[PDB]
Amino acid sequence: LEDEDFLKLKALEFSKDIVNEKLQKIIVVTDGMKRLYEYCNCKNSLETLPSAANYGSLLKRLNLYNLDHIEMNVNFYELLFPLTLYNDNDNSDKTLSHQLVNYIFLASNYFQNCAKNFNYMRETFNVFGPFKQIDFMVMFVIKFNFLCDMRNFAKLIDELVPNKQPNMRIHSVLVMRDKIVKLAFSNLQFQTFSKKDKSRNTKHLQRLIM
Amino acid sequence: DEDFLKLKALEFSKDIVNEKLQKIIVVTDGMKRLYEYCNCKNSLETLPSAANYGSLLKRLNLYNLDHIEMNVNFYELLFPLTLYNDNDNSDKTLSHQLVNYIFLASNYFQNCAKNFNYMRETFNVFGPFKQIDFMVMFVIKFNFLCDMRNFAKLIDELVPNKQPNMRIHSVLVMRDKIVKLAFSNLQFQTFSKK
Amino acid sequence: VNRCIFASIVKSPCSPDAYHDDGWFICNNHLIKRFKMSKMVLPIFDEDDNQFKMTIARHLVGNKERGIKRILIPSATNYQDVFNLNSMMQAEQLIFHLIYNNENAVNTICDNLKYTEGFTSNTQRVIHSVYATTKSILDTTNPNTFCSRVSRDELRFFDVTNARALRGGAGDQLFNNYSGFLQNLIRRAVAPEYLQIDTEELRFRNCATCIIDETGLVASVPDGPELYNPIRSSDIQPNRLQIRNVLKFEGDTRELDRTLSGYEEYPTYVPLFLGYQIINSENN
Amino acid sequence: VNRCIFASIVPCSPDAYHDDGWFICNNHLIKRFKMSKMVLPIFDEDDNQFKMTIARHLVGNKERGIKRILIPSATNYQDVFNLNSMMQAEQLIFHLIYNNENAVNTICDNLKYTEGFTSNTQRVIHSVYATTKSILDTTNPNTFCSRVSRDELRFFDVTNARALRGGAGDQLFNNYSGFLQNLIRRAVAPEYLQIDTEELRFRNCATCIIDETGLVASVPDGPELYNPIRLQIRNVLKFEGDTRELDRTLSGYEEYPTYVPLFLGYQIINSENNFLRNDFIPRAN
Amino acid sequence: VNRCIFASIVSFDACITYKSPCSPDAYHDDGWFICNNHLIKRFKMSKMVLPIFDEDDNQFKMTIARHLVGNKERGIKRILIPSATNYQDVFNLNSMMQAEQLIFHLIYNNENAVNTICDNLKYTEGFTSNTQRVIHSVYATTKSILDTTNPNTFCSRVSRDELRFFDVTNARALRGGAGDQLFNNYSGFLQNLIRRAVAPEYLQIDTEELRFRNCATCIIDETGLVASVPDGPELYNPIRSRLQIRNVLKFEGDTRELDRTLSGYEEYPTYVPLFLGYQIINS
Ligand SMILES: [Zn+2]
Ligand SMILES: [Zn+2]
Ligand SMILES: [Zn+2]
């Protein structure tokens, strides 16, 4: 509540300094969104599953909002790969490789344990969140918490990094890890067992126009 | 041409919508001015009549919603129908056709992903300003969305069962897995600082 | 030992095949009798041994056949007309009536035989034993019931659309309504073009060969002219003269092949490809 | 007598000794184009016989692009024939075939630059050359009096045969060197044959689509069919060959060949049936 | 002498004779009263020992087991022990023989099932032979063990002479905690069984703490012991002993002489020992 003000600008500094996206394009740290985006205000932990006690007020906000809007897929390769295609000018490459790959596999194992343990998480949230949409809230919050800790990580690593030329040594295991994520979603049966009809049922397809 | 079965689907959806749970705010959605020019509703992607409306650049510039590297959850897109067939019981009244329709849609995604590797340039020939980099996936999704829009008219009065068909659900899983796998082949090749 | 239905029946010498393990309800001789086919196999495997050796069959439907003669196996509708069992033995008529569930005709036969002394004196044991045996053979499979004791649900599909027809497909209901051994024999006969492995999908031919009509299984091209069928003519009325026209070769120089004969050769028969198959990752 | 075109090598399998229009050993056909020399037998109701030449597809399923390519375009030839992996003789041969006179003369001077040529190995090398050269010379259909097809035409599309339509692929076939066209006509069995009085459809669908890039193996559509065959991975995927033995019956069942035959293009005979002039003349349309 | 409760199996009726008897270990004395045969047959573990120096050739040697479950099994397939809530549906006791069923009802204190069983016996020829007194002698054995266990053991160590925490050492392991207390719910017989099946992660002796593994292998469960990692993908189990897939992407290498060359070097066993809990011993 005392020192964010600098980073508020920092997240936008280099992006406003540059105008040169020519194929690959970023939402500028996505840095413009409603109170939900403004709520991510703490050094949460990426290492572990969320500290459910932290988020009760967030859940009570979410109760004002609908949640049948959420894709299951992480879009791991899709979103992350474009925002990594950049390097130093031929220096500290060891460093860059190390933090990049380590963060990569950290997110990998993070999602792997999320999928392996989603039941315990959603139930431990529901224990005090008896809300009818609590499962969608849990899924959303999982995504959003990951995204926010990622935004903080990005904010922190924000550096010159002008260089841009693919390293296929980096991009090789790209496919292996991303396809393991999608295989995790395949391993998610998504459990059609007589509960999702309580949803808006894909908004009845909105007159087949959405 | 007419709304026609649009109104019939509207009627059926009204018959299902006995509940509102309204006044909940939709922060997420900004679906400005959706338009439904998709009367060609073709099974296949080749139409220059789709590129006819390449002016989409203009509406993009006003409200972009660019979606890089777009990949689709076929499972989630098709799941809702899984419970609806059982307004009646004890027949494949439509499922006999739904299964093969699912096969066809999956095979479509198997093949158009291959054909994309050259069809981009045909669309640049349709319009040299292109920006096909995104519009190709745009149309790829949109045309099947139109297919679904008409397919719903082909099925009409179907209502949510509580009992799932394990066979159908397994079919959905086993097709969608490979469908998602197909996207793995998407790759980029030394564009430098683009 | 002999599993041929005609082996159950009571000259009509069976082929020796149906004496053997594979449990086909017909010897290969009587597979001629109305069915224009020979049973076949496809050695299939990974890169060693040979693992799966899936059965298939080739028909010998004549290229010049049309209509009924294009139908491979009549539907329960009009099978009686297609066959004209009146041309056949009462045993054969009974059997077909059983397979098609024409229990009404079964009743009519039993009514006829009841008052005959040849029925009571000798033939009743034949009729009843044969009947029981046949029905028991049906029940040996009948995967619709009985634990589905034979095989599984199998994850087979036949009704796959071609890419260009309407959103049609029907008459699997009829498929089911057919005595299940017919379904199982079709499973003997028809490879899918495609098989899902638990983790992989594999394709075996570029294009399908056969169609299912409400009238029956039909050997038809999906489009265009029928392929020429060189029916080998090695195997099968003289009461009345039988006529044919046939366009045939003429020419010399066949010795030219004397050298080429050493090369690899391609058998040219018409296997049946129709449908899809899968293997479950788990029987969830 | 041995007359594989790889007898030039300075070894071919025994089939090379047949004087037959393959003009290749199956050895070298495999080693460079991954196909196996075949004949299709054809029979009548009479049981009279005829035969057509074939060579089933053999290159692996999964690989893509140039890996699908069996024979590139002359425009793209080295992209397969990455000469610098390949022996000089091989390179020279292929250059000749593609009419690459530029490269021809380049190698011609390379002989001098190989200062070991002072040993006059050039005599042997060029004798082998001329030997080869002879073969192409004989293949040339353009030679004035060489005999040509009377009753016969071939096209590489149904419509191109049915109405003499200007197929661009057909044109590029024509633009190929005469030997290449010869080898194609030798190897390629049609989807269709018209006859002076009759027509025959061999399949409802072709095996492969071939394009300007070269001999393309690709299926027209859908997935490729199965094609069965140190710090590396044998990587074998293998299956439950449970051996629930059934050979006791199955030995009698006809075993379908597990192969990818060629059914490619539309042949026409539309004149007095006279085919059995059994000379491997260029026989051009 | 014979001690395996399953070696105590007997038939009330003349047909079956259970002719797959207990392993020799039934005659041995670990105080487990379980043939390793049955251990496999119903639980899928193999018992083992770790010797530990008493800083000397004097030693404390702790019995443990290894689970035998593969990487593919999930949920009920991975359950090793149930709750009394769910032993029935976990086991399909009806498929098990009536002596097995009644013995499990003894384990779960299901007096209702015991009563129904006796009420069924009232008319049985086993009741005519009064063979139920076989069950009552099994009860005598049990009650002796129980007066040696439930009053004793943990309760005795409420004297503070000893304590084991089954709680996960890592506080981040949110799935831990309350299960360590739920431990209290089970029959002390079972509690003894599990605690002597499972190695601690640490031992306190006031000389020094000892740490036996980096990170706990096992986890407490909501109904009964399950073969599961605390977190992450399951570690591979080389269990080493229908047309299904058999694919294994072997490395290409053909060399074999290297193996004969390397027989001289530690052939590291790959079993899954059970590490869980905090151990405290006085002195
Ligand atoms: Zn027979
Ligand atoms: Zn050769
Ligand atoms: Zn025992």
Side-chain angles (χ1 to χ4, degrees):
Chain A
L1 74 168
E2 302 294 354
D3 53 2
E4 177 51 29
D5 300 340
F6 162 55
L7 304 173
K8 305 182 186 166
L9 186 51
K10 198 206 169 190
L12 181 141
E13 288 178 350
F14 186 67
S15 195
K16 68 157 190 67
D17 305 344
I18 68 186
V19 304
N20 323 76
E21 297 177 335
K22 193 165 63 183
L23 179 57
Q24 303 297 353
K25 295 163 184 178
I26 89 168
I27 57 187
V28 176
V29 189
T30 320
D31 197 30
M33 235 291 183
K34 307 300 174 66
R35 316 314 187 181
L36 308 170
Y37 174 75
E38 310 161 35
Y39 189 95
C40 278
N41 311 334
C42 55
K43 300 184 176 183
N44 193 31
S45 175
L46 182 52
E47 180 186 357
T48 64
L49 308 183
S51 177
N54 296 53
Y55 320 109
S57 301
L58 175 60
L59 305 185
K60 296 185 177 183
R61 300 179 180 212
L62 295 163
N63 288 330
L64 309 170
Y65 317 126
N66 305 283
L67 298 96
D68 288 333
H69 319 152
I70 307 160
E71 180 176 69
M72 309 305 287
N73 297 319
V74 168
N75 311 325
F76 182 94
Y77 157 61
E78 300 76 344
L79 193 144
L80 310 174
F81 166 95
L83 307 183
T84 63
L85 310 182
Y86 40 81
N87 288 172
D88 196 17
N89 290 337
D90 300 331
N91 290 270
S92 303
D93 184 18
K94 271 84 187 175
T95 316
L96 284 63
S97 302
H98 301 323
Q99 58 258 15
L100 294 162
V101 172
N102 291 6
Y103 195 78
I104 285 285
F105 281 109
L106 167 57
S108 187
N109 287 273
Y110 168 89
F111 298 122
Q112 292 158 234
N113 281 277
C114 300
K116 295 167 177 53
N117 295 280
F118 178 30
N119 309 309
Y120 164 81
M121 288 193 294
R122 91 178 79 91
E123 177 57 13
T124 49
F125 277 98
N126 172 59
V127 159
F128 66 94
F131 319 131
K132 181 262 180 173
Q133 58 188 8
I134 188 65
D135 54 352
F136 295 96
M137 301 163 81
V138 168
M139 155 54 75
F140 170 74
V141 167
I142 291 160
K143 289 187 161 194
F144 185 55
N145 179 85
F146 168 85
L147 292 161
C148 292
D149 277 344
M150 173 49 195
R151 178 204 70 187
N152 303 335
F153 164 85
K155 279 178 169 183
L156 297 161
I157 68 165
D158 285 339
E159 293 155 29
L160 287 294
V161 73
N163 203 14
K164 286 204 191 185
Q165 201 67 257
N167 186 352
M168 315 314 288
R169 293 182 183 174
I170 306 169
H171 321 310
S172 59
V173 180
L174 183 69
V175 310
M176 288 285 186
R177 55 209 177 229
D178 180 74
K179 83 197 190 178
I180 285 184
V181 180
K182 278 60 186 191
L183 176 59
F185 285 105
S186 174
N187 296 314
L188 292 171
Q189 291 175 328
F190 308 110
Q191 299 83 23
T192 185
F193 313 136
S194 307
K195 63 187 180 179
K196 299 183 187 291
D197 70 335
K198 310 302 178 274
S199 311
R200 291 91 176 185
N201 306 330
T202 316
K203 311 176 179 181
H204 82 273
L205 317 179
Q206 296 202 159
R207 322 170 299 281
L208 322 182
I209 171 170
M210 57 181 282
Chain B
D1 309 324
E2 191 169 28
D3 306 75
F4 183 23
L5 303 182
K6 184 196 297 180
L7 285 54
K8 297 284 159 286
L10 174 60
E11 286 175 297
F12 184 58
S13 57
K14 180 180 65 175
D15 300 341
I16 284 84
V17 175
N18 312 289
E19 299 187 340
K20 285 185 178 183
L21 192 59
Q22 264 293 356
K23 307 184 179 182
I24 303 188
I25 292 163
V26 182
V27 188
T28 323
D29 306 330
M31 58 181 182
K32 300 188 190 183
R33 304 188 178 200
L34 272 54
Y35 300 134
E36 313 311 315
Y37 322 116
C38 203
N39 303 314
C40 192
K41 64 188 71 172
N42 192 32
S43 178
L44 298 176
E45 71 292 6
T46 305
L47 277 297
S49 68
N52 169 60
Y53 199 63
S55 313
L56 169 61
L57 301 167
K58 304 170 185 179
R59 177 178 170 117
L60 185 153
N61 183 64
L62 300 179
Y63 186 54
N64 183 0
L65 298 185
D66 52 9
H67 312 310
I68 181 61
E69 196 71 25
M70 179 44 62
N71 302 326
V72 181
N73 191 313
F74 171 78
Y75 170 105
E76 285 297 337
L77 288 192
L78 279 296
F79 173 87
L81 304 184
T82 56
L83 293 173
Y84 300 163
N85 187 3
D86 307 336
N87 192 31
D88 298 333
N89 297 277
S90 178
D91 187 26
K92 306 176 182 169
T93 179
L94 298 168
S95 184
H96 190 276
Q97 300 181 349
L98 306 184
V99 167
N100 72 25
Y101 166 76
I102 292 151
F103 297 166
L104 178 65
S106 164
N107 303 344
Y108 160 48
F109 302 112
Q110 301 175 348
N111 288 274
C112 63
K114 308 175 185 180
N115 310 347
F116 156 86
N117 301 287
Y118 73 93
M119 292 186 312
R120 308 153 296 100
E121 314 187 343
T122 63
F123 280 65
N124 177 84
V125 169
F126 296 157
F129 42 81
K130 65 112 185 176
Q131 298 300 326
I132 188 63
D133 306 329
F134 86 103
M135 206 174 294
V136 62
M137 313 91 79
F138 172 75
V139 172
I140 283 289
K141 288 188 69 178
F142 182 68
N143 292 16
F144 182 46
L145 309 187
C146 320
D147 184 9
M148 300 145 71
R149 276 169 55 78
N150 292 282
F151 188 74
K153 305 172 177 178
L154 314 180
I155 59 175
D156 298 342
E157 189 211 329
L158 300 178
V159 297
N161 191 341
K162 297 169 186 173
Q163 170 61 51
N165 181 307
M166 68 307 290
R167 191 174 180 171
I168 295 173
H169 184 269
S170 307
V171 164
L172 182 63
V173 171
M174 69 183 66
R175 283 301 193 123
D176 181 69
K177 65 191 185 182
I178 313 189
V179 174
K180 283 172 172 160
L181 176 59
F183 307 128
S184 59
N185 304 281
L186 309 169
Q187 296 189 6
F188 304 103
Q189 197 164 6
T190 57
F191 313 148
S192 82
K193 210 195 69 181
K194 283 206 185 183
Chain C
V1 185
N2 197 344
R3 314 311 167 133
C4 184
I5 183 60
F6 300 86
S8 77
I9 296 174
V10 183
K11 291 187 178 184
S12 183
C14 283
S15 150
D17 67 325
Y19 298 71
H20 303 86
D21 67 352
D22 199 22
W24 291 58
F25 323 100
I26 200 166
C27 73
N28 212 39
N29 284 7
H30 301 123
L31 188 58
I32 307 300
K33 212 184 202 286
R34 314 287 176 246
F35 331 89
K36 313 168 183 278
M37 279 179 285
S38 184
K39 60 197 76 169
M40 299 185 72
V41 295
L42 196 76
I44 287 298
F45 56 170
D46 49 44
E47 68 93 47
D48 75 65
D49 192 0
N50 194 279
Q51 293 174 310
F52 299 118
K53 303 184 289 183
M54 306 312 303
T55 63
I56 192 157
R58 64 183 175 80
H59 68 80
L60 292 180
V61 175
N63 190 28
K64 314 307 302 184
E65 286 175 287
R66 286 85 189 82
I68 298 171
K69 296 187 291 291
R70 303 236 59 84
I71 314 168
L72 296 153
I73 320 172
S75 175
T77 61
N78 295 319
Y79 78 93
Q80 304 193 121
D81 321 321
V82 170
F83 297 127
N84 183 3
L85 315 177
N86 313 285
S87 71
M88 313 190 194
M89 309 195 302
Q90 293 69 12
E92 303 174 284
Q93 303 150 24
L94 170 63
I95 296 159
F96 278 59
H97 300 321
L98 295 169
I99 295 164
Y100 289 100
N101 299 316
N102 185 20
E103 182 271 338
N104 294 318
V106 179
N107 308 328
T108 311
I109 308 300
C110 291
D111 306 339
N112 310 340
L113 275 73
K114 171 180 172 192
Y115 300 110
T116 68
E117 186 53 58
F119 166 67
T120 60
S121 286
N122 312 92
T123 312
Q124 75 287 20
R125 67 209 66 156
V126 180
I127 298 148
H128 306 174
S129 72
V130 170
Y131 171 77
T133 306
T134 303
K135 185 158 180 51
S136 80
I137 288 158
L138 319 186
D139 317 330
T140 315
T141 64
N142 292 352
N144 63 312
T145 82
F146 175 34
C147 315
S148 312
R149 170 270 166 272
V150 294
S151 69
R152 311 294 174 276
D153 303 337
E154 189 63 23
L155 322 172
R156 189 63 200 265
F157 302 82
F158 314 99
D159 292 331
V160 178
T161 49
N162 71 70
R164 56 186 181 181
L166 79 172
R167 303 177 186 79
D172 180 59
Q173 308 92 334
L174 314 171
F175 168 100
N176 316 322
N177 306 342
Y178 308 155
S179 181
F181 81 96
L182 300 169
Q183 310 173 37
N184 190 254
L185 178 60
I186 302 150
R187 296 173 172 176
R188 300 287 214 300
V190 189
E193 186 174 317
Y194 296 81
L195 174 58
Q196 281 202 354
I197 310 84
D198 303 351
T199 77
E200 185 57 29
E201 201 178 309
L202 201 55
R203 193 188 176 187
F204 336 120
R205 196 178 158 119
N206 184 263
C207 56
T209 84
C210 206
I211 195 162
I212 312 157
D213 296 342
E214 69 284 15
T215 61
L217 191 65
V218 169
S220 85
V221 294
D223 60 357
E226 303 299 337
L227 312 176
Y228 165 66
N229 195 355
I231 78 179
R232 189 56 73 173
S233 190
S234 49
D235 304 87
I236 298 177
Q237 293 297 316
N239 299 110
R240 190 266 187 186
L241 195 75
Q242 195 178 351
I243 308 81
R244 300 177 310 299
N245 62 4
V246 175
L247 280 286
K248 293 179 179 179
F249 298 179
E250 51 175 74
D252 302 13
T253 312
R254 291 182 65 169
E255 202 69 6
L256 181 59
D257 192 15
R258 183 171 180 164
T259 63
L260 318 180
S261 62
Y263 311 161
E264 284 180 311
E265 293 208 337
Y266 184 79
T268 68
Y269 312 104
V270 192
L272 307 173
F273 302 95
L274 189 54
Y276 289 164
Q277 183 55 53
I278 305 91
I279 325 168
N280 275 341
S281 63
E282 208 51 24
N283 301 297
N284 301 303
Chain D
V1 185
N2 198 339
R3 291 298 184 268
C4 178
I5 194 157
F6 296 79
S8 305
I9 281 174
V10 65
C12 304
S13 47
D15 58 292
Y17 292 59
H18 314 82
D19 189 11
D20 197 12
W22 293 129
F23 218 118
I24 197 175
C25 52
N26 209 33
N27 258 6
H28 293 89
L29 183 71
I30 293 163
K31 288 179 295 181
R32 299 295 176 266
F33 309 107
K34 297 77 54 169
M35 292 183 285
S36 183
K37 298 160 67 182
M38 289 171 80
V39 285
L40 175 66
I42 300 100
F43 281 93
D44 194 62
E45 183 65 13
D46 198 352
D47 203 2
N48 286 305
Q49 190 256 49
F50 183 67
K51 250 174 179 172
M52 290 196 294
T53 48
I54 34 155
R56 71 181 173 285
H57 186 84
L58 308 172
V59 298
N61 184 282
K62 314 310 306 176
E63 310 197 317
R64 303 89 65 87
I66 72 177
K67 318 307 300 174
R68 315 313 311 162
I69 290 278
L70 295 164
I71 302 174
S73 293
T75 51
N76 303 99
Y77 78 112
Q78 176 156 6
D79 318 329
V80 184
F81 320 131
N82 293 271
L83 306 175
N84 302 301
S85 66
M86 331 179 79
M87 210 280 274
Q88 172 277 324
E90 317 181 282
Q91 304 167 7
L92 188 56
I93 304 149
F94 313 153
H95 286 154
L96 302 144
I97 299 161
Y98 286 111
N99 195 20
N100 194 353
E101 168 47 32
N102 306 264
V104 169
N105 71 46
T106 314
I107 305 160
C108 197
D109 213 14
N110 304 347
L111 311 180
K112 188 198 73 211
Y113 299 132
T114 59
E115 187 275 346
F117 86 104
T118 59
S119 181
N120 303 319
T121 314
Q122 172 275 348
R123 195 276 298 189
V124 178
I125 301 164
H126 165 249
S127 176
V128 179
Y129 158 78
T131 316
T132 320
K133 191 66 182 70
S134 85
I135 304 164
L136 182 55
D137 309 329
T138 316
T139 76
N140 179 14
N142 310 277
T143 54
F144 314 134
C145 272
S146 68
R147 297 182 285 140
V148 296
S149 292
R150 338 171 198 162
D151 318 296
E152 312 172 356
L153 299 80
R154 182 55 162 293
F155 316 72
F156 315 114
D157 194 4
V158 175
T159 63
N160 298 350
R162 181 176 172 190
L164 310 178
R165 305 188 188 161
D170 302 331
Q171 179 191 4
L172 272 59
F173 171 98
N174 313 334
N175 311 341
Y176 272 115
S177 73
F179 158 67
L180 302 163
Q181 294 177 44
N182 185 2
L183 176 65
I184 304 150
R185 207 172 187 269
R186 171 64 189 204
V188 184
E191 313 150 50
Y192 273 83
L193 177 62
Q194 285 173 357
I195 313 88
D196 192 0
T197 313
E198 186 57 27
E199 184 186 40
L200 303 169
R201 185 185 184 181
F202 318 127
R203 311 206 319 171
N204 61 319
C205 67
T207 328
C208 322
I209 72 177
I210 302 147
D211 211 349
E212 69 178 31
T213 67
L215 183 64
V216 185
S218 180
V219 298
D221 51 0
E224 303 278 299
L225 313 181
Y226 182 38
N227 187 26
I229 297 179
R230 182 158 62 195
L231 302 175
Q232 291 187 358
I233 317 83
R234 66 193 66 188
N235 198 60
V236 294
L237 289 91
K238 291 201 168 180
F239 314 116
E240 186 158 63
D242 203 19
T243 313
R244 303 170 182 253
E245 185 52 86
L246 301 170
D247 282 2
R248 307 180 170 281
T249 298
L250 297 181
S251 64
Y253 291 17
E254 198 167 34
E255 306 74 5
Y256 194 86
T258 60
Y259 305 133
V260 182
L262 318 175
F263 289 97
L264 318 164
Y266 197 120
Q267 191 69 48
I268 301 171
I269 298 166
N270 194 30
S271 175
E272 64 88 24
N273 297 308
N274 212 5
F275 173 93
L276 291 159
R277 58 210 166 256
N278 64 7
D279 304 334
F280 192 63
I281 53 155
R283 210 186 184 117
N285 289 4
Chain E
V1 177
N2 183 10
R3 311 180 197 73
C4 181
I5 217 65
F6 312 106
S8 183
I9 186 61
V10 183
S11 186
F12 279 66
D13 298 300
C15 183
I16 294 169
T17 186
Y18 326 119
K19 58 209 306 181
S20 289
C22 297
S23 156
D25 75 307
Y27 320 116
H28 310 181
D29 185 16
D30 58 6
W32 296 15
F33 320 100
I34 193 166
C35 72
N36 209 63
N37 284 359
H38 293 74
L39 190 68
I40 313 146
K41 199 176 184 176
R42 286 287 170 275
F43 307 95
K44 309 166 290 297
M45 293 80 78
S46 193
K47 69 187 65 170
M48 269 199 62
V49 65
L50 169 63
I52 312 90
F53 312 95
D54 191 16
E55 308 177 320
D56 186 41
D57 292 346
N58 286 271
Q59 288 158 78
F60 277 106
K61 307 192 282 190
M62 169 154 281
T63 327
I64 332 86
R66 80 181 68 150
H67 87 86
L68 316 170
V69 184
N71 288 84
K72 326 306 294 181
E73 292 61 26
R74 321 181 192 191
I76 296 165
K77 311 170 192 280
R78 312 204 68 71
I79 299 174
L80 318 181
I81 320 169
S83 176
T85 314
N86 60 343
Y87 67 97
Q88 172 59 43
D89 62 0
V90 160
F91 287 118
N92 184 341
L93 294 172
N94 307 70
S95 72
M96 301 195 184
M97 191 271 292
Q98 50 79 29
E100 318 181 62
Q101 303 171 9
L102 72 87
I103 290 164
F104 290 117
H105 296 308
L106 302 176
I107 291 163
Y108 298 110
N109 296 318
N110 185 357
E111 170 179 21
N112 298 319
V114 170
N115 299 358
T116 302
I117 291 162
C118 181
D119 303 336
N120 279 257
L121 269 69
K122 308 296 184 174
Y123 42 94
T124 64
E125 299 297 75
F127 184 83
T128 304
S129 58
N130 196 28
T131 298
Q132 60 157 354
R133 301 326 177 172
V134 173
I135 305 167
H136 293 86
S137 63
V138 167
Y139 152 80
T141 311
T142 304
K143 184 69 172 66
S144 74
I145 310 146
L146 272 289
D147 286 355
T148 307
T149 299
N150 296 17
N152 336 52
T153 66
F154 178 96
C155 299
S156 321
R157 304 145 204 159
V158 180
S159 68
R160 164 73 184 136
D161 308 312
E162 177 292 328
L163 186 52
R164 173 62 153 287
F165 302 101
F166 315 98
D167 181 29
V168 185
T169 191
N170 187 5
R172 308 295 68 74
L174 309 187
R175 184 70 67 83
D180 198 0
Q181 178 280 346
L182 300 180
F183 184 96
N184 301 291
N185 313 348
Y186 292 81
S187 170
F189 161 68
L190 316 166
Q191 300 175 339
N192 183 0
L193 191 57
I194 186 166
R195 73 179 289 145
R196 294 193 298 146
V198 182
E201 305 163 64
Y202 285 93
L203 171 63
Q204 263 287 3
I205 57 169
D206 62 12
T207 299
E208 285 198 306
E209 182 173 57
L210 302 178
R211 189 182 174 187
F212 310 115
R213 194 176 177 95
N214 54 16
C215 310
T217 69
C218 321
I219 204 163
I220 317 164
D221 298 326
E222 305 82 356
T223 54
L225 193 58
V226 171
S228 63
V229 294
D231 51 8
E234 305 291 355
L235 306 178
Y236 177 54
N237 192 347
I239 287 170
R240 190 252 177 276
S241 306
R242 201 163 50 235
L243 296 68
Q244 312 189 249
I245 186 60
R246 296 282 75 85
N247 66 333
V248 174
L249 309 175
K250 292 70 177 180
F251 207 83
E252 191 278 325
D254 64 339
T255 58
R256 308 184 175 202
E257 305 72 10
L258 74 170
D259 185 61
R260 305 189 184 85
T261 319
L262 297 165
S263 67
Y265 311 105
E266 303 184 271
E267 309 75 3
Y268 185 65
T270 63
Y271 321 125
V272 188
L274 325 179
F275 288 82
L276 188 54
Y278 225 131
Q279 186 55 59
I280 305 91
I281 297 178
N282 183 43
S283 78

